Structures are given as structure tokens and as C-alpha cells.
Amino acid sequence: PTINQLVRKPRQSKIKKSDSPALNKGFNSKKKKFTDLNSPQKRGVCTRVGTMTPKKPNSALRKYARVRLSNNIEINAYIPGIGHNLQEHSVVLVRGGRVKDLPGVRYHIVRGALDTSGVDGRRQGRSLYGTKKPK
Amino acid sequence: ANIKSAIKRVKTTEKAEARNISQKSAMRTAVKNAKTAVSNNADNKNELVSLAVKLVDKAAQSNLIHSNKADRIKSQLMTAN
Amino acid sequence: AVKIRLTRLGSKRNPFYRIVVADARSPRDGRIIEQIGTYNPTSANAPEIKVDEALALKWLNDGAKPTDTVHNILSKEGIMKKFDEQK
């Protein structure tokens, strides 16, 4: 635009909508209010453990878990790895990162953490997927 | 709480309050009497005014009122006189 | 009141001091009025000291009161001597 049009109407940049919104909100049990926190991870309770069919191009039974976080927020989280020991009423640690196939899963359950075991036979890539150094 | 210095400071505060309020009460009585005598031009206006100026400056020395407040009262009294 | 004192400017076990005119109520490493000089007590052998003369004698005449060791520092430059000469 012209300089005068810019002076009257300064340029407005676009706002950035962030992924993993449920990690950006805290809770205050005393005031019954939601806060803004920007947490790396959040801890929740598994209210449902099951398996989800993936998007159309792919075909594989993917394990997931419905997790109610520390907030009053109920999200769906992926379970990386082969074997998992999670049933209902399991405390998990949930990080960011979505699954492309699974529609409605925007988070990942951290393996090898509070009440979540690692992958039994993992030998290369043990930082991810939990599990300690064999021998 | 109750630090030893604080517990004593309460006793010396009421002690100073009792002495202070008696003195300004006497001052304010004199000031009211002085300006009411000036208004009707009584025969005793002059020493009542002098009694008020005396008590006003005595309290301003005791930090009961500020010095600048004493002049406003004093200036008011002698101007009407 | 106004005090001529030392402000710590050193790291762990390596203190450096500035000779500063500051109010007594101010924090040690906080608000100041004027910087006068420096004091390094950990230099090679003798503690190297640097003091200005015009401002130091200006604040002393204005009623600034040196602390115990600023007195020593001002004495090693004869500042307290010349302050005494002008009675």
C-alpha cells in the first residue's frame, strides 16, 4: 500500500497456532481455573487402552491410549514400541508429536518413565523407547 | 512475633500518645477560644491570642504539628486580630 | 549518613573493591552517588589502590565519613593528611 495507508493501518502479521495445545495449559485446583504454562511434558491417567485403525494409505493396528492429563483435558496418545504394560488407571507421561496416520492422536506416551516400561528387546535406540543398557 | 524491642515500643507509644493528645487538646481549645474572642471583639482577645500563639509554637517544637502548620494557624489568628 | 565505603566487585575468593561515596542506607553493591577510586587487596604483594583527589576532598568537606579501611586507603595517599591541613 501507500505510506499513508501503512501509517493509518500498520501491517498485521499472522498469529501462530501451536500444535499440542494441551501441553500449553495448566490448572489451578484452588481457584478452579485454567492457566497458561507451556510444559515440555504432562502427566495423566489412562482412561482407555486400545487399538486404532490407521489412515487409508497405510494398514496396521496401532496401539493408543485415552489420557486425562493433569489438566481437565482428555487427549489421545500414541504408544511407541512393540510391547506395553498399560491398562486403565495407569499413570503415564505424555509428550508432544502427532501420528500422521491416526486421526485424533496428537501426542506420544513416553516409554521408560513413570509407570511405563520400555521395549523389552530394544538394543539400538534405547534413548527413545525406554529400556536400559543391556549388561 | 513479639521481638523484645517491639514489645517495649508499644508501651512507650501509648505513653507518648497520652502526653501528645493532652497537649494538642489544650492547644486546640486555646485556638478556638482565641478566634471566637476575635470574632466578637471581646476585651480579652489579645492575651487569648497570645495564649494560642504560645501553645501553637510549643507544640510545633514537640513535633505535635509541623512547623509550617503552626504558621498557618498563627498567620490566620493575627490577621483577623 | 553519607559514607565513603568499598563495594565488592570480585568473584569467588578474588575480591575487587571500588572506592565509592554512597548513602549508608543503600545496599553494599547497590545504589551509589559517586565513584572515587579502586582497591585491589589481592594483587602482587602490596594491595594496589587508586584514589582520586579532587572528589575525595570534595566529599570529605561535605561531611562524608570514611569507614575504617577507606580511612587507611585515604591515609596511604596522604588524603587524610591534606584534609587535616585545611583546618
Binding site: 505510506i3 499513508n4 501509517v7 | - | -
Partner: protein
């Protein structure tokens, strides 16, 4: 010392011993650099209210008079 002086235009004389002086000045834009005209209204004291709406007058600051006025009328130069 010196108290600041402004020259503006009388835009209100509906109050006694008080006029409103419009001191228009210029402020550049931080980003684009264009100078934009902006105006500021000053409430000034004048015991003898000889200023009438439309006069350019001389204004100098002073101690607080009333809740808003901080200026006095120094010189009236226009007629309108």
C-alpha cells in the same frame, strides 16, 4: 531556570478564566518515517479572559491550577 512555552490556538472559551489551547505538533512514525500531525489540547488560565475562540496565543506552564490547568496565558497576538 526556564518554564516551557507553547503556541497554540484557542478552541474553547466557554469557561470563565479558562481557555483551551490546541497546540498542534508533528510526530514521525517509528517504522515508516512519515511525519504525522498530532494535536494536544492545553487548558490555560487567564484571569482577564480576553482570549476568544480562534485566537493564536502564547502559553507558559505554571504550578497546578485546578484539576487540569497547568498553564497561563502570556500573549495574545491574533484577532480573528
Amino acid at each position: 531556570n526556564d518554564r516551557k512555552v507553547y503556541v497554540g490556538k484557542v478552541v474553547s472559551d466557554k469557561m470563565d478564566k479558562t481557555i483551551t489551547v490546541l497546540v498542534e505538533t508533528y510526530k514521525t512514525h517509528k517504522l515508516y518515517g512519515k511525519r504525522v500531525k498530532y494535536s494536544k489540547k492545553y487548558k490555560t488560565h487567564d484571569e482577564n479572559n480576553s482570549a476568544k475562540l480562534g485566537d493564536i496565543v502564547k502559553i507558559q506552564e505554571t504550578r497546578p491550577l485546578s484539576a487540569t490547568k497547568r498553564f497561563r496565558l502570556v500573549e495574545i497576538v491574533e484577532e480573528s
